[PDB]
Enzyme design. Structure first.
Site, mmCIF file in Angstrom:
data_model
loop_
_atom_site.group_PDB
_atom_site.id
_atom_site.type_symbol
_atom_site.label_atom_id
_atom_site.label_comp_id
_atom_site.label_asym_id
_atom_site.label_seq_id
_atom_site.Cartn_x
_atom_site.Cartn_y
_atom_site.Cartn_z
ATOM 1 N N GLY D 42 42.657 26.853 37.995
ATOM 2 C CA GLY D 42 43.925 26.644 37.187
ATOM 3 C C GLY D 42 43.552 26.838 35.943
ATOM 4 N N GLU D 66 42.924 36.427 36.738
ATOM 5 C CA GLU D 66 43.791 37.256 35.971
ATOM 6 C C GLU D 66 43.980 37.107 34.780
ATOM 7 O OE1 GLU D 66 45.404 40.110 37.429
ATOM 8 O OE2 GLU D 66 45.851 40.368 35.157
#
Ligand SMILES: Nc1ncnc2c1ncn2[C@@H]1O[C@H](COP(=O)(O)OP(=O)(O)OP(=O)(O)O)[C@@H](O)[C@H]1O
Ligand SMILES: [Zn+2]
Lengths: 79, 454, 70, 149
Positions: D42, D66
């Site tokens: 995360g 990403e």
């Protein structure tokens, strides 16, 4: 390149025979290891005559200056 | 004819060339009369064969050797290494080791004696020298009959430090004498921690003092042959003085961030050594973004866990200041979680036998290991990377060799191989870069052969 | 004056060294041209500037390209 | 490894679940298959949420995904002290951190197929350029770069 190294003694017919191990191939150069003992001088002369009558590859004879005959171990280390 | 088979040869004896060991021959017609100048070749062969035999014998188990170059030691010497260390017979061998120094304060190198006088008579303003006060040492020094306390230990170094080092001549004398003391003890790498701001003046900014110290050390390094050149880096001390004074701390951090890039060869500034004192108001959470910039630029940090941090400091420093070394972490065994986090993360622990003995006090010349036994072997067993240093040379009045040999009295049963392991850990945990590390590793391989073997 | 400009998406290393550069050059020179203060091309760092005010350097903020009074 | 992944608009209840589960499993088992650490799929700071994890000695890996930022990699190393960075393909873009990751021994987990399929890099190029995989640049700089699936 192929070379042969051999010591000589009272039997001077050793190096000539050993030089034919490759047979017809021959060897580029064979060196003779010899001592200062006088019992091998006739053998040295015979080997010299053999080399002269069998020209081609380089030939040499080396005699041990300080090793005339085998008496003690110091001669052995020097050899 | 009979063929005996090929002879591939010997790896260290198939590369030899005739010219290296020439043969003298006298020509008599067609027969060459050779002669042997000497039996250097026989000794060469014997040495090669002996070294090969030693390598093969100790080969199986090279993973246990602190230095891979020890595989050429005779098996008797390898057995010797695995025995206990002896403070009496092993003076010379320890004196001959190429060691590493990582905790050596510049302000306490010549605090007393002939070195103090040599420093004083080098001042550029002889009439500005503070009077040499009276500082009687406690009885039994450097082995006190009782612990003297951190306050008294610090006060022992009044003659030197900020009192004298403001003078450029005294500073130069301090630097030169410290480098000489390092060289005389066979140290292959050091990290001297200085306090430039403490030596500033009205006309001498802290930067000027730092530049002078760095250039003095660089000069001393330049004149020495590269075989005995003790590469010395610098650590800036951000002392957590009581009261909350942050001017000197901020100045030191900024000076470190500047020097980190100003120099890139020879003596350099490699990190800071935040003291982070204990008294429940500074600790290691003093961070307050203070040490954020030092991390931001790629500098290292090394805390000074004081004379009673109690596991909370050793955690606040490890996990909030991102410290890569810890000083005097003697109460680390308390929490079994810190002794494992330190071992896993690879955080080196800097220990000072003589200073710890003189301040905290420890049982001496013990046969076995008790509750109060010096934690050197306890730390080593758990896998921690323990290192041995000198703290303050002048105040402790004991060099690196004295500290190393005092372990055999502090920690019963300490072996020589563990001394070598401590040296290797100190070398590997230093703040050097590739060039300095490579030089240090090349210097470490030259372990002095023992004089006895039995 | 030494500039300490914030970059969006960039590194904060420059801001880290300019502040240290000023705190060092502020004490170095006491005559003639001096590094007298620091500047901010952004935040328009309450903890980054704790060192600066402790040393005694003036700070001049630069409200660049915004219409917020906060 | 228990992946404690934050949810974009989700609930921190799952993160609390996973941190507590990891802290308990760490002590419960001591032989065979164990729980070694928590993965942060995360990562931004999550500083106080992770103080208990460090107090008991569990490792933490930081999962980069990403992403093209260099501050995430910086806060992973120093705020939520990480011991492995996952997928950190843009780390030379801050020459100051390619020298702290290399000096502190923070391994970089590289996934060849994952990183090629997510982003794509030049393939079988004769010579290294500016778009080639950063594996060798990491290796030659002292970074402990690994390869996984
Ligand atoms: N063993 C020690 N433990 C803790 N703090 C120490 C120790 N030795 C020195 N210090 C402190 O760290 C700094 C040592 O740096 P340095 O000796 O170079 O400077 P100094 O101001 O001349 O020191 P001193 O007060 O010892 O004369 C000083 O703040 C000193 O108080
Ligand atoms: Zn210290």
């Amino acid at each position: 390149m192929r070379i042969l190294l051999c010591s000589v003694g009272t039997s001077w017919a050793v190096v000539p025979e050993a030089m034919q191990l490759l047979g017809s191939q021959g060897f580029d150069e064979v060196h003779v290891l010899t001592t200062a003992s006088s019992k091998i001088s006739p053998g040295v002369e015979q080997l010299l005559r053999y080399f002269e009558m069998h020209p081609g590859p380089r030939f040499s004879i080396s005699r041990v200056q300080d090793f005339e005959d085998l008496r003690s171990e110091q001669d052995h280390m020097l050899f | 004819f009979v063929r005996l088979g090929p002879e591939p040869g010997w790896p260290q004896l198939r590369l030899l060339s005739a010219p290296s060991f020439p043969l003298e021959s006298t020509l008599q017609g067609p027969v060459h009369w050779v002669r042997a100048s000497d039996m250097r070749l026989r000794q060469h062969v014997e040495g090669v064969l002996e070294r090969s035999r030693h390598i093969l014998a100790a080969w199986e188990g090279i993973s246990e050797l602190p230095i891979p170059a020890l595989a050429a030691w005779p098996p008797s010497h390898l057995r010797w290494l695995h025995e206990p260390l002896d403070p009496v017979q092993d003076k010379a061998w320890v004196q001959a080791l190429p060691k590493v120094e990582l905790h050596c304060h510049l302000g306490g190198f010549a605090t007393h004696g002939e070195l103090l006088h040599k420093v004083r008579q080098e001042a550029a303003n002889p009439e500005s020298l503070p009077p040499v006060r009276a500082i009687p040492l406690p009885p039994g020094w450097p082995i006190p009959e009782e612990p003297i306390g951190l306050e008294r230990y610090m006060r022992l170094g009044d003659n030197n430090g900020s009192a004298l080092l403001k003078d450029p001549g005294c500073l130069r004398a301090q630097c030169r004498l410290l480098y000489e003391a390092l060289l005389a003890d066979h140290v292959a790498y050091a990290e001297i921690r200085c306090s430039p701001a403490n030596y500033a003046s009205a006309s001498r900014s802290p930067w000027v003092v730092l530049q002078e110290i760095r250039n003095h050390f660089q000069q001393a390094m330049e004149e020495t042959p590269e075989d005995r050149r003790c590469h010395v880096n610098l650590l800036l001390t951000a002392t957590r003085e009581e009261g909350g004074d942050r001017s000197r701390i901020a100045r030191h951090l900024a000076l470190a961030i500047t020097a980190a890039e100003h120099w890139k060869n020879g003596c350099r500034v490699v990190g800071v050594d935040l003291a982070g004192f204990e008294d429940r108001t500074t600790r290691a959470a003093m961070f307050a973004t203070d040490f954020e910039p030092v991390h931001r630029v790629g500098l290292a940090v090394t805390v000074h866990a004081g004379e009673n941090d109690d596991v909370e400091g050793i955690w606040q420093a490890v996990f909030k200041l991102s410290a890569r070394r810890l000083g005097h972490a003697l109460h680390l065994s308390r929490s079994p979680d810190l002794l494992r986090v330190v071992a896993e993360r690879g955080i080196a622990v800097e220990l000072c036998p003589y200073a710890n003995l003189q301040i905290k006090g420890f049982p001496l010349d013990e046969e076995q290991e008790g509750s109060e036994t010096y934690p050197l072997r306890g730390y080593l067993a758990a896998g921690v990377a323990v290192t041995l240093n000198t703290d303050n040379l002048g105040i402790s009045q004991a060099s690196l060799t004295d500290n190393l040999l005092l372990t055999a009295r502090l920690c019963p049963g300490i072996t020589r191989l563990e001394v070598l392991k401590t040296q290797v850990f100190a070398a590997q945990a230093a703040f050097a870069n590739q060039a300095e590390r490579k030089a240090l590793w090349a210097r470490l391989a030259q372990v002095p052969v023992p004089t006895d073997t039995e």
